[PDB]
From a paper:
Here, we report on the determination of the crystal structure of the DTA from Alcaligenes xylosoxidans (AxDTA) at 1.5 Å resolution. The crystal contained two molecules per asymmetric unit connected by a non-crystallographic two-fold axis. Each protomer comprises an alanine-racemase-like domain with an eight-stranded α/β-barrel (residues 32–274) together with a β-strand domain consisting of residues from the N-terminus (residues 1–31) and the C-terminus (residue 275–379). The structure of the AxDTA dimer is similar to dimers of alanine racemases and involves non-covalent contacts between both subdomains in a head-to-tail arrangement. Clear, residual electron density in the active site of both protomers was modeled by a molecule of pyridoxal phosphate (PLP) in two alternate conformations: covalently linked to Lys59 (occupancy ~40%) and non-covalently bound (occupancy ~60%). In both cases, the pyridine ring of PLP forms π-stacking interactions with Tyr187 (distance ~3.7 Å). The ion is coordinated only by two amino acid residues, His347 (via the Nε atom, 2.2 Å) and Asp349 (via the carboxylate, 2.2 Å), both from the alanine-racemase-like domain. Four water molecules (distances from 1.8 to 2.3 Å) complete a distorted octahedral coordination sphere. The metal binding site is located at approximately 5 Å distance from the aldehyde group of PLP and the manganese ion is nearly coplanar with the pyridine ring (0.4 Å out of the plane). The role of the essential metal (manganese) ion is most likely to activate the β-hydroxy group of the substrate for deprotonation by His193.
Residue numbers in the entry:
A (entry chain B): 8 to 379
B (entry chain A): 7 to 379
Write the structure that this text describes.
């Protein structure tokens, strides 16, 4: 029937890309990748960047080319397109619960070098049974609660027991701890973040010491996000960093204070067209909730003081034109910074890659919608 | 040897064995909602043109048409393509189309199907005529009027009249009437307030239609309405066509409206989620977060579990608070969640697991997912 033309062709000026589109500024992205890897290298810790941020095997390949020690995925099915692209060192930074999931994990563990988290005795036993059935081996990290109050163990006896059992069980190798504090990532001041990161590191170190004193090596302590890796890398406790959003940035992370040694550029935008100029004081954009999420608020208009993206609907954004500011014309194309990287990536099937205002390529967000 | 991802669901599966998270449709509730909306429209002798933006699913639109819907609405031109591929050829683009590639695609769509579109801008009306002329196509044009939402739409008599006169005179365009959509009244909570605001919206639309008629221009269609307002819009004597979308499904934001009148809808749309951690007394963690259901209107609700409150929502986790006295779900238990907002949740998924009496019937393709160009 009717064919849908691609939104962008290599060689197109950005202004001719069809909207809304998710756009990557390649030089900013590349600089962010280098900066995070250099930070890890400086502190002699590993970087295992989180693929949930972008769900894009081409991006993971570029991270690995710069020295990343594998990637993280949050869900077992999310790993499949990365393995298809030849990426075979993957940490599932989550617990895996459900018969189909553990069966799939067993197959993944035969095809690749996999680790997973556990925080539950029953699940550790389910994991062992599934590995044994699959003829597979997996590394196991015990997840500890360091203050987020999501998943993770919070008592010594349970950490010790899970580690002892992973050691004794066939198909399982005890590899260390996952210690991730999600809430600290967006505490605004560096002083606030540093204080909570110090406490998270102390908790993780205490569990690692408990294990060591019981004769169990605790070789990996992994965790950290884009807001905390400034501190986690220097803790002398974390051995591996799991930052994901750093390559892109968004307006929520943008609101943090970044006046220390580690800073990232905006590289990720939603391109949108002005499609109504209905009254003085406002214009309407064609990018709404279906193109960028708003659990953390609306997107921000990039490089346009005076324009304020206000109400967001399904397929419309209401932009207020502040008094004194020039209203954009009908058909004008604007760049928006999403408020939150990962859920925005998960709305799109393709990423338009730009350099010097010209389209270079379109990369496949091949793991979009893989949450099983 | 590439690793195959098994389907989440197969016909015959018990619901509890469906892999999670999955978007699930209760077929009997859905069918009841479809019938109730079509009956409401027929009772008031107005057309129903249900909005496909809600579900992006050609199978659902086919079922709406089979009950007597007069075509469908789409919000974006590219969203229409999978519906045309499924044989649907009466489509209203309930939005303005701006941008050279969009207008070119609209030209091709208008050759393949009977299309209407909205305009609120003189320059764009001229662009639309040019694009139709270039495509060799004809399209129906509705002038969008602001009836109180303050989004798009014209708000002065002179412009409504000029646009209609020009659509009549321009090649490739046929003036078909008015789009009058009040999006913000839909979730005003009391029926008393929705009714009052709907009466005023109807009066504004009627006054524009009157203006056109008095100037010798017929105004055949006045289209608008959403799930929250169609109780009142159908009975207005002004609207000729209703554009409700969410009614087939419902969600927790619409659920918070007062619904104690003659028109009510059942919950038919759920996100199925597994308990994947039981880390402390008082909470469990679900495997459905923002990547499976959106939260611009708040978190989803746990269906049928009074003492379980879905609290914090992350990317791939939901923190569920177990109320004092309530029974915490076991590890691996499967729960149904009602999304806070239908359309953006549908847009996260590629397939819809269709269930009847606890048994999987089918999986329908959400074929227009991600089509916002
Ligand atoms: C397990 C895990 N590691 C790392 C991160 C870091 O993510 P980001 O740097 O994108 O904030 C997250 C998300 O918060 C996470 O859940
Ligand atoms: C043009 C248009 N018509 C109708 C509706 C009603 O949609 P729903 O009934 O799903 O709320 C909307 C969005 O709310 C809309 O944008
Ligand atoms: Mn995030
Ligand atoms: Mn909606
Ligand atoms: Na072992
Ligand atoms: Na005409």
């Amino acid at each position: 029937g009717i064919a849908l033309p691609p939104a962008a062709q290599p060689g197109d000026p950005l202004a001719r890309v069809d909207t809304p589109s998710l756009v990557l500024d390649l030089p900013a992205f590349e600089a962010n990748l280098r900066a995070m890897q250099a930070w890890a290298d400086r502190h002699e810790v590993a970087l295992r960047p989180h693929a949930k941020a972008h769900k894009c095997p081409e991006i993971a390949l570029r991270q690995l080319a710069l020295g990343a020690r594998g990637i993280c995925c949050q869900k077992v099915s999310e790993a499949l397109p990365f393995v298809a692209a030849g990426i075979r060192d993957i940490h599932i930074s989550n617990e895996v619960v459900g018969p189909a999931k553990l069966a799939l994990l067993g197959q993944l563990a035969r095809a690749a070098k996999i680790s997973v988290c556990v925080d539950n005795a029953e699940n550790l036993a389910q994991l062992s049974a599934a590995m044994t059935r699959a003829g597979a081996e997996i590394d196991v990290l015990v997840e500890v609660d360091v203050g987020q109050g999501r998943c993770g163990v919070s008592d010594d006896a349970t950490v010790l027991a899970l580690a002892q059992q992973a050691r004794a069980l066939p198909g399982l190798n005890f590899a260390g701890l996952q210690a991730y504090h999600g809430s600290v990532q967006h505490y605004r001041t560096r002083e606030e973040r540093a204080a909570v990161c110090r406490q998270a590191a102390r908790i993780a170190a205490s569990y690692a010491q408990l294990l060591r004193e019981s004769g169990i090596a605790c070789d990996t302590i992994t965790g950290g996000g884009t807001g905390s890796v400034e501190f986690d890398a220097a803790s002398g406790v974390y051995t591996e960093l799991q930052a994901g959003s750093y390559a892109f940035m968004d307006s929520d992370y943008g609101a943090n204070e970044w006046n220390g040694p580690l800073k990232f550029q905006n590289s990720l935008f939603v391109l949108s067209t002005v499609m109504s100029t209905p009254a003085p004081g406002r214009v309407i954009l064609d990018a709404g909730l279906k193109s960028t999420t708003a659990e953390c608020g609306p997107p921000a208009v990039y490089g346009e003081p005076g324009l304020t993206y206000a109400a967001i609907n399904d397929e419309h954004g209401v932009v207020r034109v502040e008094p004194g500011a020039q209203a954009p014309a009908l058909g004008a194309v604007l760049r928006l910074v999403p408020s939150h990287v990962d859920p925005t990536f998960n709305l799109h099937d393709g990423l338009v890659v730009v350099k010097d205002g010209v389209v270079q390529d379109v990369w496949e967000i091949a793991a979009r919608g893989f949450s099983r």
